[PDB]
């Protein structure tokens, strides 16, 4: 089966450079032509670069020209994208595309930002004072993505909602994880949220009291 594997993405500061690679396999790499694409968080996909089968003709987008440069090593079966002078707009997941006169990879994620690696602060979400009750944890002021949340070490999945994180104006991420339970269960069952942020090696369990 024809395949492309992207790599080289990561967290980078603005104005800095980064080059992606795309290992092509399962097809004659020197004959086929290649494309670069990117998808910003939530937005539609966006084309950025195109190269010929030999590296002859090359064309970028307007937001990337003069900073992004496309290339290809036909001997190692690889397509390259050097991205210089990176800007916050460039933050996206970049996919490697084949073309025919198509097949898309998993993509590699590039996050450009001036924030530093920082573990999250976990706070209880408990109501103030009905058949169903709600509790949760707020996972605030962390970067980079992702963080994982489970409830009672994975035993409590029914009624759990872990929302997609949002990017705050400070450049830090934040999310909430909630669970709704029968209002009678309060007082004999316990509810603790488990938060993992691998980049900062942050592991926290917080038991939420109503």
């Amino acid at each position: 089966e024809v395949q492309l594997v992207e790599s080289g993405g990561g967290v980078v500061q603005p104005g800095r450079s980064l080059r992606l690679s795309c290992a092509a396999s399962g097809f004659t790499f020197s004959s086929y032509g290649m494309h670069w694409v990117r998808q910003a968080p939530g937005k539609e996909l966006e084309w950025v670069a195109v190269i010929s089968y030999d590296g002859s003709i090359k064309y970028y987008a307007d937001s990337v020209k003069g900073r992004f440069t496309i290339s290809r090593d036909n001997s190692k079966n690889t397509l390259y994208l050097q991205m210089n002078s990176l800007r916050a707009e460039d933050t996206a997941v970049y996919y490697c595309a084949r073309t025919g006169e198509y097949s898309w990879g998993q993509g590699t994620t590039v996050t450009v930002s001036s924030a530093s690696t920082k573990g999250p602060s976990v706070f209880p979400l408990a109501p103030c004072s009905e058949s169903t009750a709600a509790l949760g944890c707020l996972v605030k002021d962390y970067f980079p993505e992702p963080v994982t949340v489970s409830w009672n070490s994975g035993a409590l999945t029914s009624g759990v909602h872990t929302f997609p994180a949002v990017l705050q104006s400070s450049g830090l991420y934040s999310l909430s994880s909630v669970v709704t339970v029968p209002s009678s269960s309060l007082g004999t069952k316990t509810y603790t949220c488990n938060v993992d942020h691998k980049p900062s090696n942050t592991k926290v369990d917080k038991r939420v009291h109503h």
């Binding site: 996909l45 307007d62 979400l125 109501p127 004072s129 169903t132 707020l138 929302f163």
Partner: protein, 215 residues
Amino acid sequence: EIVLTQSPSSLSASVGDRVTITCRASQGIGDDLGWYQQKPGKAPILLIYGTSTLQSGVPSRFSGSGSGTDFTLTINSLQPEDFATYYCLQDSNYPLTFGGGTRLEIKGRTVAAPSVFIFPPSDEQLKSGTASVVCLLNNFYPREAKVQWKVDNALQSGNSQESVTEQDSKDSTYSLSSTLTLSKADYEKHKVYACEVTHQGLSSPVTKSFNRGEC
């Protein structure tokens, strides 16, 4: 560049329904328009290459139609595996262009109002000099909802961030979170913090509120 306008934005259908999605080309692109399927956290799947030319690995359920400026993706006999977001693409000339996308939602079996909760800031966060008031809307349908923060009857804006889960596939519902963020100094100047929710399932807008010291 050539603008591909996709219609509609979101779209609800049931397992079995026959549904079609429109993509329009700002100027002529010929027969070179294709169609892609993307599910959350996945890579785009090439449904169709150019116009109606269906591709290997895709069932005959899918169909392309149109030519020139107007194009259409049509799916016969909807299956649970086909609920995703669909994107039209043209490689007629550079730069390559994509449509705004059409998210294919599960047509909710019936209208469900959200369960609304409001969470005050924790004391320990109040230590940190900041305050986060959270408003939760639980398991509602349809997705369209309106959450308005009130602080001593003053309508807030630019003040909060919103988050939506993907559509639950057991009950076809959605959940929404709204975080209002103040400083401790700001938070302590005001007394009643209210969350007002407008949704189709609620005949009147529901207001869940708390007052400082109450918690």
